[PDB]
Write a structure and sequence with these properties.
Blueprint: E1 3-8, H1 14-28, E2 32-38, E3 41-43, H2 48-53, E4 57-61, E5 75-78, H3 80-85, H4 87-95
Parallel strand pairs: 1-2, 1-4, 4-5
Antiparallel strand pairs: 2-3
Helix pairs in contact: 1-4
PDB class: transferase, transport protein
Keywords: Phosphotransferase system, pfam02379, PSI-2, Protein Structure Initiative, Midwest Center for Structural Genomics, mcsg, Membrane, Sugar transport, Transport, transport protein
Assembly: monomeric
């Protein structure tokens, strides 16, 4: 199991949020995989198996993300800016499953 994230923004912030999440996860000694949805497209797309196994998924997004793949999973939906400003809070909420089922 590992927590997952998706970051996205209209102009494709996306990458700054992914960076902040990854750097903070390393600081906290926890694994994370971050899918990005930017201007060039999708990178590090989450797999169905990763999603099944995830305690929760962080979706830090300022544009629409494909969400139906997350049905039944706990999803912490926040603005993309939250990934930059408060990655520790998001990671620790995801770990604690402090997120509603989608």
């Amino acid at each position: 199991a590992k927590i997952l994230a998706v970051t996205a923004c209209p102009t494709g912030h996306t990458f700054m949020a992914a960076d902040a999440l990854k750097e903070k996860a390393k600081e906290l000694g926890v694994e994370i995989k971050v899918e990005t949805n930017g201007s060039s497209g999708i990178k590090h797309k989450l797999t169905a198996q990763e999603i099944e196994d995830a305690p929760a998924i962080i979706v830090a997004a300022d544009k629409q993300v494909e969400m139906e793949r997350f049905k039944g999973k706990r999803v912490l939906q926040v603005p993309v800016t939250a990934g930059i400003r408060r990655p520790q809070e998001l990671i620790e909420k995801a770990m604690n499953q402090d997120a509603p089922i989608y």
